[PDB]
Structure 1
Amino acid sequence: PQITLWKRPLVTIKIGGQLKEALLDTGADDTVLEEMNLPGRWKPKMIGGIGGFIKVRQYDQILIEICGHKAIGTVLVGPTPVNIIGRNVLTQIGCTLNF
């Protein structure tokens, strides 16, 4: 669909059999989710944001569905203020910016 930006672009996503609300974030290279129980092996990693760096759990080849669009990519799990959907996932669902 076309999504205007007068509100936060929040969407219901499905990961690990759970539904969650996430923010479509064209300023994030990577997708970062709040603390959660995800099945599958993971590797430690660090990501930095506007305020510094945090510790995350990196899950590769994770199934994600966004508004009926399926993705399979890396998901970082850690103390992010918000579930954010980064470009690694947004490209898989064919998301573009237009003005």
Structure 2
Amino acid sequence: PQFSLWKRPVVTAYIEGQPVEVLLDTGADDSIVAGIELGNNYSPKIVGGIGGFINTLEYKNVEIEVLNKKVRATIMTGDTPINIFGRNILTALGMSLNL
């Protein structure tokens, strides 16, 4: 599909079966989502946002379903004011920025 960027490129994803709304971010290197609990392994971690730092948890080998595609990705969880899917999952789906 094609996202015209005239409005926020939002969409539905299922993190291990759980539906959440996310904004596709081409400037971020990683992925952060709030409101999710998982059984995969993890390790604590601090991320730097545009405004400052927040505390997160990082899970690995997390199965994600987006745009009818399934991938095994690494994702962070914490109290973010906006859910985002960064480049790490975008490249695995074959997405590109055209002009």
| TM-score range relative to shorter protein | over 0.9
Distance in structure 2 (CA, Å) of the matches to 1:25 and 1:77: 16
Matched residue count: 99
* Structure 1: gaps of 5 or more residues: none
TM-score by length of 1: 0.95
What's the secondary structure of 1:46's corresponding residue?
Answer: strand
Distance in structure 2 (CA, Å) of the matches to 1:29 and 1:12: 20
How far is 1:60 from its partner?
A: 0.8
Report the counterpart of residue 39 of structure 1 in structure 2.
39
- 1:55-94 maps to which residues of 2 (within 5 A)? 55-94=55-94
Report the counterpart of residue 20 of structure 1 in structure 2.
20
2:73 partner amino acid = G
TM-score by length of 2: 0.95
CA RMSD after TM alignment: 0.9
Percent identity over paired residues = 49
- 1:6-17 maps to which residues of 2 (within 5 A)? 6-17=6-17
How far is 1:35 from its partner?
A: 3.0
Distance in structure 1 (CA, Å) of the matches to 2:65 and 2:35: 18
Contact in 2 for aligned 1:58/1:76 (Cα 8 Å)? yes
2:2 partner amino acid = Q
Report runs of 4+ in structure 1 exceeding 2 Å deviation: none
Contact in 1 for aligned 2:40/2:61 (Cα 8 Å)? no
CA deviation profile, 1:28-78 (whole Å, cap 9, x unmatched): 100000132122221101110101111111001111111101121110001
1:98 partner amino acid = N
